[PDB]
């Protein structure tokens, strides 16, 4: 036994489609609906659990920071749309989500999880996997966390900003780059402007 | 064609061994040398390039922040040990590394890169892949960046700290957790202490 | 169409996490040896026909228990979702507290072994299995999604299998306790048919 | 492993053969029944025990099916010549006497095997009943071990229920009979049923 | 076209439920070791040529038993149909009481092993097998559906094989008890041909 | 055991050199279309039971011809051997003149196709085949080596197949021309059985 | 073209029934160990070139026996055919009495092993094999059907193999007993060639 | 053991470089259509029996050419070694000038196609093939290493095949021009055997 | 051991990035049609025998160019490492500026096609290939790691192949321009041997 | 594709056969040469052109190899009988005359094929030369197309070089001959050679 997935960095993100809960309603959603925008596509283990609601809420409460840089966010677990909706209709105080502006996509058949290489065969759900997909549908970044440890909205934002910067300019982003940081001309002569 | 690797989160990190440059000298190095400590094991594309030296230097200048939490750092590219050494002997001003305290591991056969799933078959080198491996040799975290965008030492530190926290305590780390942040008892009754 | 479930052969082994009296417990088919088991799958928590079936069996559990029969319900939902559904009031389509274990089949292994998994939907249809005290599968009832099962019919079948286990005689169409039975012999059958 | 071509919500597997209908041999085809519901049932063996009671039970209540546009066909592995002899045997001798339900012959066993009801060790079927709708789709499968007969009441209840759900945008609760409350399968609409 | 039945090899083993004297009994081929056996298949219970053949052998069973030979009939019908047929009077195409076991081959395994199963019809053709006291298949006769077998011919063949088992001579065309036989030797044969 | 001969299917095609009226001729199964054919194998020229069978049929050939039926015999021997055997007087176990073609199956292909070839012996058993005017195999009779076939039984079978080809009725056990037949119908059959 | 016969390897084992002095005997290749054997196939009994070859060798057998060499002939015909052919006078193309065994290869296995079997004809070509006292195949001669072999050439070959088995020298083209031979050495050979 | 060479089929095609009249020339089997060809392999240049055989055929080539037959010799040696051997005087085991083409089979393809290659030794045995004017293989003679072939026997065989090509009669054992032949007919044969 | 490189067959096609006059350029085997090519692999940049061989050929390039022959060196190193090595002074084991292209084989495809890739080491041995103006492979020289090649021997071979391409005659052992040649004919060869 | 068993730095493929040695046939084995260096070379064909010049070139300079503990063996597909005739042919006739180098025969072609020098279209070898060390390891492979002979000088230079590097911890630069400067294969030690 060894690890298989369709997700490859610099190649089109694996196509997905299914039912999502969007503003309390069931809707058809597909990867290609986001063509033209960056997409932060992330999986979480299970509705009605622990680290999961904090990550959905963390992104959800900061959604405008993504939308103002032309970036959408979609969360996905193996739960049904009916469980997603019941979880949204559970108050935050009870480990619920409350109203949420991020689509919750359902992957009940597990095909989307397997395609993205985040499915845990022994558990029947996913680990914490996040995928940054560009406006052309190309996969740029993959972040996979073991179960006990949540993700960072700050780090996700920095990555989206850096990919959009390098999309638009001839230069590349050094370690720890934030908007306004110095960049490098990827040329053996050009690079010296940065290194001096 | 689809994506293969031996690296699986919650399973032992794929074994590796080879020649590294360690304090200007060639030495035998192997994954199991780090048993007993956390390891941040990361690949970078190519010696004498652009984003690569900034990431090695960023980690290298902050190495004591890793060592004080019982964590080592190893960098790896497909370059030979001789190229690594020549790069270390190149002043930072010329895009060189200068003296460095992080081992530079050589993966000339590409077997280590393929095992870790970071090898780019069309390019002959790796993308930017970072792996956090615990003191028991188990893989906890995988971060893969497309070429133009460097990694973050801050985010790597936060992850190491969070994994070590959840190793030691019964609780799990919510989104954006830093030392001193609130955590959750992964219990449907216990969790309410956090959510209230 | 493939399955391990075959009438008159041992029921396919299963094990997993169930919610039992509000708590997570490991549950196994072998825990039921010595008793009859009604083991049924329903599609999805927080749906429509499913709560009515679970509630129907739960509220009538004593009619099974007084004839040495237990009842277990299973869906592909997680134990965390099972528990949330139980903590949801009946008038909201929830289960309320419930005396029947809710087995979780997240990996879909159990559903596939039993032949009830719908590949294109990601959940089960309405599949019910009657398993005897020796662990042998006696009865399979599979319903399409829109139509619920009958506790009365399920009880009748359990009683009939128990009657025929105990007695040398067999059970005619519609048999209920107190109805005529047949000696399965070419000469003996005549006492029934005359 | 158990193989079968019968799958709920797919076309019932096609069959054709010789049946005894009103004392005569006739070619009978599953497609003869398009436009009507069909109760299609297998019984182990002619000149046995539970089998005649099930055939007579359905036969004597046949107008109850015919008034809801539903036909009934019985099948065993016996030849048509044996079916005809069994019919010509008085009910008091465990014969059928005259009957209005066709007795389909499956001498080659291909029909039994297609329906997943054939017993390889025994050479005849178990007690398998199949409810097929007017569009030829399989809706319901009931398999009994040998000792225990089926119920006409229950078969009637199921036919009625499938026909109700075909016509209405509502679904049938546990134990539903004509005149019982039904549910709207929507997370908001469902409450009309549950609030009670 | 395949079967396990080969002349001069052990007849393929069989076992199943037969109706014997109105009762269900387990019957096996090895129950006949030490006797010749005429083992024959017929298409279907409650048909036409089949009852005449079963009755013809049954009514003449002593002609077999007095030469240490038994007769068993087999079809794909169940033992319950066999018994019903037996309980049907001859005038109605029934068998009446019968002294020959009626073997049931519901699973079709025996028929296929004997190479007599018709895949398109779900029953056997008219196949008859003569098996010696050591269990070796000596003779195979297979008829299409419309034409019954001959008890006289079957008797002739059993008698011929028993004669050749016992003596060193072989049986000419049309041989009956009392007929001339041949010494199977290029010199010895001349005693027969020079007449 | 493998063969292409199956009852109710076209008899397997054969062609080869036969000795006919002391001459070598090409003969084909399809030469016989439009008439019944009795096609039978015998083990070996210059042996024992084999000549008696060829002579038995040959001496009674007009009984076949007068019911539109031909007879062809076949062994694995060459046509040169067949002709020598015909040219050997009956009293030395020879055939003498004969009116039945002796087909040669030197390559063994015909014997194998008919499932009568004995791999350990290099020759056939005694296999007889009745083939109708349409080329359909109707009857198969296989004898172990020591026991010869019967001309009477062969005639009876051919007459019975021709009767059932021509009429709606089927032939009971032991049927001969003039015997009662059965209407193969649950109602019609009662004419025969009601006794 | 497939065969097990290879020069300088053990001749392929054979066994079968042969006619020897008018009797059927089991004969085996290994019966001939310790002597040379001329083993030859001929197409068919009761034919044309075949009897002349058998007679040619048979009439000159003492020339073989006196160099410790036996002769065995084989065709696909049966032993019964072989005996009839021996019992047919030479003037009718028969063999008459003969002192060479006639081996029967009825199953065709021996012919196939020797690569002489003609699949389209069902019999062999004219293949002759010279096998030494150790069972090693030394010589292979295959003729198409129309042309017979030579007893003189066969003797010459056997004498030459026996000479080279016994001496250090090899036999030139056309060598007969008494002819010059060659020392198979770059230096030694010059004794022969220096002319 | 495998080869493409089969009697009564087209001889396997070959082509390569031969030494002809001291020169290198491309030679192909089809260059001989319209003539008989004696095509023979010998183990190795600069050996022992081989020069005697090549010289024996060469010195007698007119005996072939006057019956419309050509002779070609072949070994696995290169054409350069063939020419060196030719330029070696006979007294030294050389060939001297020769009128027969010496074909080179360095790749071994021709030898393997003809079934004469010895895998353990890297050269051929002594294999001779007679091919008719239509290109059909008529005769195969294979000798173990120590024993040469006969020009006289080869001539006899070519003459016999040409005789049987031309006339309807076949050649008895030891046939030479002038000898009695046989009409291949069971009646016609009697004109030969009755003498 | 597998390779696509076969003497007297077209040299295996290659293409990749080379450093040529300090810049990255796409280079292809087909760019050399019309000329002889000396195409050689060396193990690794910043090593020991390798710079001496590259420098030996570079400093003597005119001896190849004046006979219509070009020279290309290849290792598994990146073009970025090739360029750094060129920007390293000779006295430090660097190449200094160089007039011979340095082809990069990072993917190892070219090395494998040429049969010179060492699986356990991740780089090539010392493999040199002489390819004629029609793109046909004429000569293969493979050295174990510790021993460098000879520009004098390589030049001799190029000259000999060019001589025999032009003339009907062949080149004896040790042949240099001006040495005796042989007519490859059994009669003609005698003018040489007498 | 080109197949061969000959690999540099692995044991030279074993061979054995009949050779002509001092006018006589003798069994010769690769392992006869253990303890000594071996120059093992193939030539196309006896009684040809370049081949005799190479054999004589090596033969006349054989003491130059013998004084450095190195033996020479030549091989072609010709038989031993042809080798012997060629030897017994005067040099003036393109013969070899007497020679001190064994001529190994490879009639079956197995040796040529094992060494990857056999030409399938032609049935003989190209000009392949192999330098095998005293431990039986293959060090050097030189393959020439047919028209062009090999050099004894160069073969000598290579033998000397491999023997020098076997004994010393230094390696041989391009064009090395006895008495030439060598390099210490260490990044520090190398400078002693390069600083010049």
Swiss-Prot record, chains A, B:
Catalyzed chemical reaction(s): a hydroperoxide + [thioredoxin]-dithiol = an alcohol + [thioredoxin]-disulfide + H2O
Additional information: The active site is a conserved redox-active cysteine residue, the peroxidatic cysteine (C(P)), which makes the nucleophilic attack on the peroxide substrate. The peroxide oxidizes the C(P)-SH to cysteine sulfenic acid (C(P)-SOH), which then reacts with another cysteine residue, the resolving cysteine (C(R)), to form a disulfide bridge. The disulfide is subsequently reduced by an appropriate electron donor to complete the catalytic cycle. In this typical 2-Cys peroxiredoxin, C(R) is provided by the other dimeric subunit to form an intersubunit disulfide.
Domain of life assignment: Eukaryota
TM region positions: none
Subcellular localization, as worded in the UniProt entry: Cytoplasm; Endoplasmic reticulum
PTM entry text: The enzyme can be inactivated by further oxidation of the cysteine sulfenic acid (C(P)-SOH) to sulphinic acid (C(P)-SO2H) and sulphonic acid (C(P)-SO3H) instead of its condensation to a disulfide bond.
Active site: 52
Range of the intact protein held here: 73 to 268 of 271
Family according to the record: Belongs to the peroxiredoxin family. AhpC/Prx1 subfamily.
Annotated keywords: Antioxidant, Cytoplasm, Disulfide bond, Endoplasmic reticulum, Oxidoreductase, Peroxidase, Redox-active center, Signal
Protein name: Peroxiredoxin-4
GO annotations of cellular component type: cytosol; endoplasmic reticulum; extracellular exosome; extracellular region; ficolin-1-rich granule lumen; nucleus; secretory granule lumen
Protein task: Thiol-specific peroxidase that catalyzes the reduction of hydrogen peroxide and organic hydroperoxides to water and alcohols, respectively. Plays a role in cell protection against oxidative stress by detoxifying peroxides and as sensor of hydrogen peroxide-mediated signaling events. Regulates the activation of NF-kappa-B in the cytosol by a modulation of I-kappa-B-alpha phosphorylation.
Domain Thioredoxin: 7-165
Protein's organism: Homo sapiens (Human)
The enzyme's E.C. designation: 1.11.1.24
Gene name linked to the record: PRDX4
Swiss-Prot record, chains C, I:
Top-level enzyme category: oxidoreductase
One annotated GO biological process: cell redox homeostasis
Enzyme Commission (EC) number: 1.11.1.24
Presence of keyword Chloroplast: no
Subcellular location: Cytoplasm; Endoplasmic reticulum
Catalytic site positions: 50 (cysteine sulfenic acid (-soh) intermediate)
UniProt keyword Endoplasmic reticulum present: yes
Catalytic activity from the UniProt record: a hydroperoxide + [thioredoxin]-dithiol = an alcohol + [thioredoxin]-disulfide + H2O
GO molecular function ontology, one term from the record: molecular adaptor activity
Keywords tagged on the record: Antioxidant, Cytoplasm, Disulfide bond, Endoplasmic reticulum, Oxidoreductase, Peroxidase, Redox-active center, Signal
Top-level taxonomic group: Eukaryota
Post-translational modification, as annotated: The enzyme can be inactivated by further oxidation of the cysteine sulfenic acid (C(P)-SOH) to sulphinic acid (C(P)-SO2H) and sulphonic acid (C(P)-SO3H) instead of its condensation to a disulfide bond.
Every Thioredoxin domain range: 5-163
GO cellular component, one term: endoplasmic reticulum
Role description: Thiol-specific peroxidase that catalyzes the reduction of hydrogen peroxide and organic hydroperoxides to water and alcohols, respectively. Plays a role in cell protection against oxidative stress by detoxifying peroxides and as sensor of hydrogen peroxide-mediated signaling events. Regulates the activation of NF-kappa-B in the cytosol by a modulation of I-kappa-B-alpha phosphorylation.
Oligomeric form and interacting partners: Homodimer; disulfide-linked, upon oxidation. 5 homodimers assemble to form a ring-like decamer. Can form heterodimers with PRDX1.
UniProt record similarity statement: Belongs to the peroxiredoxin family. AhpC/Prx1 subfamily.
Entry protein name: Peroxiredoxin-4
Whole sequence portion shown: 75 to 268 of 271
Curated annotation (Swiss-Prot), chains E, F, G, H:
EC primary class: oxidoreductase
Keywords: Antioxidant, Cytoplasm, Disulfide bond, Endoplasmic reticulum, Oxidoreductase, Peroxidase, Redox-active center, Signal
Membrane-spanning residues: none
Domain Thioredoxin: 5-163
Active site per the UniProt annotation: 50
GO biological process, one term: response to oxidative stress
A cellular component annotation (GO) from this entry: cytosol
The keyword Signal is annotated on this UniProt entry: yes
Superkingdom: Eukaryota
Localization of this protein: Cytoplasm; Endoplasmic reticulum
The family this protein is said to belong to: Belongs to the peroxiredoxin family. AhpC/Prx1 subfamily.
Misc. remarks from the entry: The active site is a conserved redox-active cysteine residue, the peroxidatic cysteine (C(P)), which makes the nucleophilic attack on the peroxide substrate. The peroxide oxidizes the C(P)-SH to cysteine sulfenic acid (C(P)-SOH), which then reacts with another cysteine residue, the resolving cysteine (C(R)), to form a disulfide bridge. The disulfide is subsequently reduced by an appropriate electron donor to complete the catalytic cycle. In this typical 2-Cys peroxiredoxin, C(R) is provided by the other dimeric subunit to form an intersubunit disulfide.
Record protein name field: Peroxiredoxin-4
Organism: Homo sapiens (Human)
Organism lineage: Eukaryota, Metazoa, Chordata, Craniata, Vertebrata
Gene assigned in the entry: PRDX4
Residues of the full protein shown: 75 to 269 of 271
